[PDB]
Design a protein around this nucleic acid. Structure first.
Lengths: 98, 91
DNA sequence: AAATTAGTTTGAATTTTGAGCTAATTT
DNA sequence: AAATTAGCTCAAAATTCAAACTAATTT
């Protein structure tokens, strides 16, 4: 009665395919393509912050959406994110969203 | 100005970059839409695993398996990296 | 009026980090 | 032959955490 939804089809993105059909692909792939383009535009320059970079690039929308969803309620936001409320307030401060 | 972008196409077959954060945001909007007031519990680990896996995979590819250089690139400790590789069973 | 939340501290648990070591591997 | 890396420990630095508690908000 219940079809398996793979972890990878939970957070998905609308894409256009070789037959100009709209399909949902994993967010993984967005991250992969972004990273491939980032790597492609390096030309052997040295990197030391890739994790923080991606992490910021991903934490910011997450907080944005979860704050919109809870209508500013940090406790609920923290509770649905699965993190301590203080950690959440910290992150919110980090991205100037309080 | 945006180092992490993905490629989009519009109805006029023009290709254009867009920040990865727009993708993440879309995916979340879709997530919140798909569930109807069902409770979310571990959204951070969800997304973080969802973002950490292809990152590790791509940096390990870029450094041809060299964990020390991968770790240096990412700006984390080699131990942390080994741990993360263990976590997603890629080692 | 109750309840819930924000804003803050405090100390414990967990995680990340660096550094040191030898074995194995790459150069 | 040398240099680098992996696999591994130790403990200490940093971060996350829960538990308070009152003021302030919301219900």
């Amino acid at each position: 009665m219940f079809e398996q939804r793979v972890n990878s089809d939970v957070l998905t993105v609308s894409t256009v395919n070789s037959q100009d059909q709209v399909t949902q692909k994993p967010l993984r792939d967005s991250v992969k393509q972004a990273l491939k383009n980032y790597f492609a535009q390096l030309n052997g320059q040295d990197v030391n912050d890739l994790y923080e970079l991606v992490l910021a690039e991903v934490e910011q929308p997450l907080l944005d959406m979860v704050m919109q969803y809870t209508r500013g309620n940090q406790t609920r936001a923290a509770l649905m994110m699965g993190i301590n409320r203080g950690t959440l307030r910290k992150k919110l401060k980090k991205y100037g969203m309080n």
